[PDB]
Design a protein around this nucleic acid. Structure first.
Ligand SMILES: [K+]
Ligand SMILES: [K+]
Ligand SMILES: [K+]
Ligand SMILES: [K+]
Ligand SMILES: [K+]
Lengths: 850, 850
DNA sequence: GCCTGCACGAAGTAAGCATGCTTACTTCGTGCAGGCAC
DNA sequence: GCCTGCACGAAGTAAGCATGCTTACTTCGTGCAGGCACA
């Protein structure tokens, strides 16, 4: 029934009892491990060393049990299986310790362990009821454990005297103890074998086990009474008790060492303490008592229920949290009156939801609990049944309204489903769970037969119906047939082109379904495009494939050049290999011309004119005038960093100083030509849009209405365009009718910055500081962005360090790695030894790689 | 900006115009492909064959353009770029076809293609304004296209007469025609070069391009007027027209063949039709109009909006669906009055939700749309801001209530969050999007600072907080610290044991967090258990690992035997390899003894006594009596199918007959021993529970309350137990307060049958028919279950054919495969040739394998 | 609750998977500056 | 006036991944028989 015990001793006594109980638990764990070694291998079974180790563990367990509660007052209200052992020990002549009188019973340690706050998940089991392999007489052993005779309890199998085992009758006759006829009949059988089970004794004597044992008191009849009568007349040997207490601990550790030695011999592996605890738990798990302890521990940890109330609930409901969650509050209070309503709500989520989220009374909620078990039960129950229960007076108004609102909300939470449509769906198909099942079964026509179920309702209910119906030519019947045939939009997409054609789908429909419109731009037919998508994934990766692999499979060189986006001036100049290599390494033809030299381009196989075309238009215009020379033009462009602006923004005297092989007479002409070019630059696109042009641009971007709204709010379309150019996001948003979508339509990058989690003011500041999100990515530093008032997460997301930061790296180190290695993929493929040299942890590098 | 034209002709005329326009599109695609081949490779550029092919394509394009609208009435309301070409051609003296007069202008084909319902995604471009490489005179070519002179338009470059090209003035002098001084000044320049651009003509003559060209009518001034005056006076050559119509199509296919021949030479790959369409799209993307067309087609395909209204919306909003979805119905009707409210709701999901799901008026919804763009805007807007707008009279009551209900629902959809708590959260943190962001940032204390936010609210909002706080010793501060440090419960779980210990977590806490309770039962410490979970996933897979791999990594043989659950009589008999093999193949030691023979067990390395122990206890008891012999005992057990019951249920005369080698004297004693054994069976277990025992069993199973309710409803606990034993699921469920959970608590297998989707009556019938779900799986047939009223899906789910049915196989064939090959894994590893012999398709076997 | 391994059966439970919101891997369409000219 | 080349960045698309939820995938509960062995 109930196991409980209260500790009334001091803190020192509490710690002493804790240590004693833990040592006894270790001893009994040694007992159990020795029994497991006995049963595991017959080779170890045929070994007296294992048996002597087992018996030594039993003796140490008995000693530590005798050492429990020496003052016989540290514990009170000791209850085992419902029996109050306090009063029972009070009604005895010799009295004694109720804690020890409980520990001599099986599972009685559950009462003492609760009084000492021992972690029940370690299973602190202490049992002293060994009979077969007990080196002592079983009843004498139990009586010594009860009376706490540490002096008489041996700690070594060799210290066991025969007067306590085989020749036990020697000890009785030594103290002149009166014996009745029943105890004489017990002794006449015990003389044959002192380890005879009490069941066999009661069978042969024609009595009950209770009659054979008797009360554990000298003033009774039975073997327990006889051994108590013998023990009480024995004086306490304080010296021997002190010696056993001093010796038993090191002896226990020595027994553990011997156990590990025997395990490493017969099994070639040791039995760890955690393995012993887990095996003890696996053994005890078969018992409803341990299931109750586990349920109470879960109620304490997860739901925060008090220990006593959690134990009461676990006892009353066989340790079934699922059953407690379907039990009404009135029954919970009947079984455990100390339970609080808040604890009942925490354990019963249905009750909690009904009370708090719906304002129901406890009884009104218990109504729904009794009638439908859970919220899932309410969602599965038919609305007609609920209405009938309400009409018949069997369901209260509050509970009925709550159930109807729940069933309706479960459907109205979807887009396009109103209250009327949800009620019609409930009338048509019983319950929202049935509606969900019909949607899973793709019963699209059956769902659309109900009034209110439109295209939006179908898209929100049936998964994949939106993706199918959004294709031209595919109607509702065709989408339903495809879904029911293949088993989901995923399977329809995984289907083959030939079978999709067998279903009657157009090649355009199959292309739109499989998303291979670009792959069919690269490759002629749909079959090979689908094969490429299956093999490599995306057309982007297909383009990223190397030149040799692309020439394999069956692509021409011109096809590969079109795939990799090789320009004409780079395709017709070199071969495909070197052209694609240069393109993949530098990105742009202008970057090629800036990095690689004219002589290098010539050495790679370029025409002296094609090499100049690969060189910048600045180089081309330089070579146009007289007295240039390719190397001198290269030197000039490296001095002005390939920039006609910086070339013209210089005096010819300064120009002749920077360059190594050039005179003033030529520098004058060079600066003149550069200034002529920059004069031809204002004659290009220097015009800033006029009023009508800004008006038309606004009407294009945000529409006629919002454009007129902006023009009326501010001065004119010119002022609106000025605000747009200066990225006045806040001043644009303050206009009624102008929102984030319109601002992002006007201000480029605002949408990306908002998706990154930035406030409009933060996006405005970042744009005013850097220009665009591209320049932010290829420039902004984490310290700069922190000085702009941004958080580290926003900084990582806007710079692209999202994956590296998710790999448990700070923004600073992620930015350093990305800056050293170039790309995030390059950091992920970076050398592990190089990362270790940088100073990253092993687990950090493992997370980076995975 | 607007392109439109309406077709009023009959079905035959519609098909004729469709074919003519498609052939003209093919001809212009050939033109563009020839130009692409000219510019792609200089080797192909230096080839007159490609130029001749290009000119033939141009001539065929001109012919097909002349062949459009022969009756001059098939089209009406022709509008191109805003100009009404119907009225423009009506105001001319010669009249003509407005469709043909529009196609001579750039992009005018967009008007004609809409009248023929041609898929605009193919870009049906037709342009007849070639100047440089035009084999004919450009203005004469355009005028022939204008007046539809298919007879005068040549179909072959060799058929081109010089009087239509170099010596074009010969054709003018053939018809005299009066000419004015401006056209004479144009002719004096055209004599120098007939292909002089109109820009150059207007530049040299000091006039405008419009003044040089003139109206395409004889009653005007310009080169167009002159050529029209010349052409009108030319009689129609019906014979040449009919011959050209008969000849041009096959000529076009021949030109396509020549184009593919030239492409396979200079590029080693052909130009597919889809590639040509994509290149046309890439060219036309610079004309921005295609952006509008794509938006209109998307509005047609997804939301089912009419073509004209979709085009109007895309024009008015620059083809931005995100912008149209944020535009109110009033503005949508102002820009496109033909739009319907249902189409506006379909395109604006916010408007649809406000109108239908919330019962708002169109104006009340346009209010919220103007003020907050979208439902996301409302969720991002502060409740204080909405209340202020309502108080100041700037927001209507209906719109205010709708916005408040939306903001509240977005939070109350979570468990534990009531209306009061949602309102308090809105007051505290502005908006539900801010609440969601705070929950993502693990601001657990900041959220709990609000009244009403309890443990359930925290568990429902913060993901993983429940999993963390449900562990003993872990408090709110520790859970918040762990979440904010690692970045989610997933990362906390992926964290290492050493760093979790560095955070101060107990080993028990780390075990409960990582779910390594079984792996730490197999292996001693936590580090190796976590490594095993990382490498293999689950202890189940660790057990499934082979013997060699298990001996690797560092497991002992006894450890492997404990892992694989090898019995003692099978572990001590053979070696680990053969023991684990036999166990994985047969399951139980009794199955080993029944299948394998005594001689086989001996051949595998078993002791003559260990082989008998591996054999059944029936075999052991048989060998107990005298004069048996192991082979004779095997024969007896094979005769009685290893069943002492069937052995005792026989006469010794019948016993001596079945086995081939046994006498009557021995059969008598065998039957005697078997009957003695079955007599020793009735004293073991047979007691049908008494009344008090049934009462206690009910109190254990369904609880005290429901047990007493059942005992009162029915006769007694005995009757309740009878109902349970006979699986009276319906008769138990009819009791108020008894539900599926209690029934499954009483009736084993009911929970599994219900999770399989079976109604309680179906589960009751299946249980009454078969006994248990185990026997259903190991016995029930699909035909039997269909006769029991079950569906094929339920049959598959209850028999375990779920994966095979998901592999697009019917239940009958899936059951046949599972019966023949045993297991689903065996069907997967089955021979592909054997499956083909069975008669499965290639794709079917592929789906089985994958 | 002798005691737990051996075996089976079933959902208890927790690993593996479907699902829906989120987020750029990938599309994919736009803007614009030079460069030869139709 | 096209054409090519590159930069830009939003979501059109389509995978990424968190977060919930199935079910037998993985664990847990029960009966029994003979050995660890007792009400
Ligand atoms: K080359
Ligand atoms: K606004
Ligand atoms: K806790
Ligand atoms: K062996
Ligand atoms: K009921």
């Amino acid at each position: 029934l109930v196991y409980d015990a209260e500790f009334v001793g001091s803190e020192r006594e509490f710690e002493e009892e804790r240590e004693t109980f833990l040592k006894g638990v270790k001893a009994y764990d040694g007992v159990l491990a020795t029994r497991y070694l006995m049963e595991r291998s017959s080779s170890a079974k045929n070994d007296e060393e294992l048996l002597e180790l087992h018996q030594n563990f039993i003796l140490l367990t008995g000693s530590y049990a005798c050492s429990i509660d020496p003052t016989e007052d540290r514990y009170q209200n000791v209850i085992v299986r419902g029996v109050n052992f306090d009063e029972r020990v009070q009604r005895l002549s010799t009295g004694g310790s109720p804690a020890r009188y409980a520990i001599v019973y099986r599972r009685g340690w559950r009462a003492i362990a609760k009084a000492l706050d021992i972690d029940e998940e370690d299973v602190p089991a202490i049992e002293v009821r060994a009979v077969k392999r007990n080196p002592l007489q079983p009843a004498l052993y139990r009586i010594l454990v009860r009376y706490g005779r540490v002096d008489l309890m041996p700690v070594t199998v060799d210290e066991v005297p025969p007067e306590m085992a085989g020749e036990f009758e020697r000890l009785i006759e030594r103290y002149d103890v009166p014996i009745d006829e029943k105890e004489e009949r017990i002794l006449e059988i015990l003389r044959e074998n002192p380890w005879t089970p009490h069941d066999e004794i009661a069978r042969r004597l024609g009595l009950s086990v209770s009659e054979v044992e008797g009360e554990k008191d000298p003033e009774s009849s039975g073997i327990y009474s006889l051994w108590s009568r013998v023990v009480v007349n024995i004086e306490y040997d304080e010296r021997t008790a002190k010696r056993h207490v001093k010796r038993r601990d090191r002896l226990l550790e020595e027994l553990y060492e011997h156990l590990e030695e025997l395990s490493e011999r017969y099994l070639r592996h040791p039995l760890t303490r955690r393995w012993i605890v887990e095996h003890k738990r696996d053994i005890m798990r078969r018992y409803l008592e341990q299931r109750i302890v586990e349920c109470a521990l879960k109620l304490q940890d997860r739901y925060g229920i008090r220990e006593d109330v959690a134990l009461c609930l676990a006892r009353a409901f066989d340790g079934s949290i699922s059953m407690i969650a379907t039990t009404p509050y009135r029954t919970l209070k009947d079984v455990c009156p100390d339970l609080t309503l808040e604890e009942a709500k925490s354990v019963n989520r249905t009750l909690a939801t009904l009370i708090d989220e719906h304002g129901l009374s406890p009884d009104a909620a218990d109504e729904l609990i009794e009638h439908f078990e859970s919220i899932a039960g309410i969602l599965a129950t038919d609305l007609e049944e609920i209405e009938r229960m309400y009409e018949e007076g069997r369901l209260s108004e509050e509970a009925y309204r709550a159930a109807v609102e729940i069933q309706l909300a479960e459907l109205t939470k979807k887009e396009g489903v109103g209250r009327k449509t949800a009620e019609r769906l409930l009338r048509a198909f019983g319950n929202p769970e049935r509606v969900k099942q019909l949607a899973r079964e793709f019963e699209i026509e059956k769902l659309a037969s109900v009034e209110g179920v439109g295209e939006r309702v179908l898209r929100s209910l049936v998964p994949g119906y939106a993706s199918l119906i959004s294709i031209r030519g595919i109607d509702r019947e065709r989408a339903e047939r495809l879904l029911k045939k293949y088993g989901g939009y995923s399977k329809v997409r995984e289907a083959g082109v030939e079978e999709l054609r067998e279903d009657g789908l157009t090649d355009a429909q199959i292309r739109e379904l499989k998303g291979l419109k670009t792959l069919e731009s690269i490759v002629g037919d749909l079959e090979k495009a689908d094969e490429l998508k299956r093999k490599y994934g995306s057309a982007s990766a297909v383009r990223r494939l190397p030149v040799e692999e692309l020439r394999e499979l069956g692509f021409s060189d011109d096809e590969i050049a079109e795939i990799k986006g090789i320009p004409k001036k780079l395709r017709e100049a070199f071969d495909l290999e070197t052209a694609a290599e240069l393109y993949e390494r530098y990105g742009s033809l202008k970057e090629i011309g800036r990095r690689l030299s004219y002589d290098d381009l010539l050495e790679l196989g370029a025409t002296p004119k094609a090499a100049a075309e690969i060189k910048g238009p600045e180089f081309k215009f330089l070579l146009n005038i007289e007295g240039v020379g390719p190397k001198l033009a290269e030197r000039i462009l490296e001095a002005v960093d390939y920039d006609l602006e910086r070339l013209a923004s210089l005096n010819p005297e300064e120009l002749a100083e920077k360059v190594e092989g050039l005179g003033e007479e030529l520098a004058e002409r060079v600066v003149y030509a550069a200034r002529e070019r920059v004069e031809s630059r204002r004659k290009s696109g220097r015009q800033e849009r006029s009023e009508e042009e800004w008006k038309e641009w606004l009407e294009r971007k945000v529409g006629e209405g919002r454009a007129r709204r902006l023009i009326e709010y501010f001065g004119s379309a010119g002022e609106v365009g000025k605000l747009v150019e200066n990225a006045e996001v806040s001043k644009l948003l303050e206009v009624p009718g102008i929102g984030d979508e319109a601002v992002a339509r006007l201000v480029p990058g605002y949408k990306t910055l908002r998706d990154a989690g930035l406030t409009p003011a933060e996006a405005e500041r970042v744009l005013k500081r850097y220009g665009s999100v591209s320049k932010v990515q290829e420039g902004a530093t984490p310290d700069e962005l922190r000085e702009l008032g941004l958080g580290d997460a926003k900084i990582a997301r806007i710079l692209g360090l999202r994956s590296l930061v998710n790999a448990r790296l700070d923004v600073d180190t992620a930015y350093e790695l990305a800056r050293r290695y170039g790309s995030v993929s390059a950091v992920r493929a970076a050398p592990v030894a190089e990362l270790r040299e940088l100073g990253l942890s092993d687990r950090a590098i493992a997370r980076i790689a995975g």
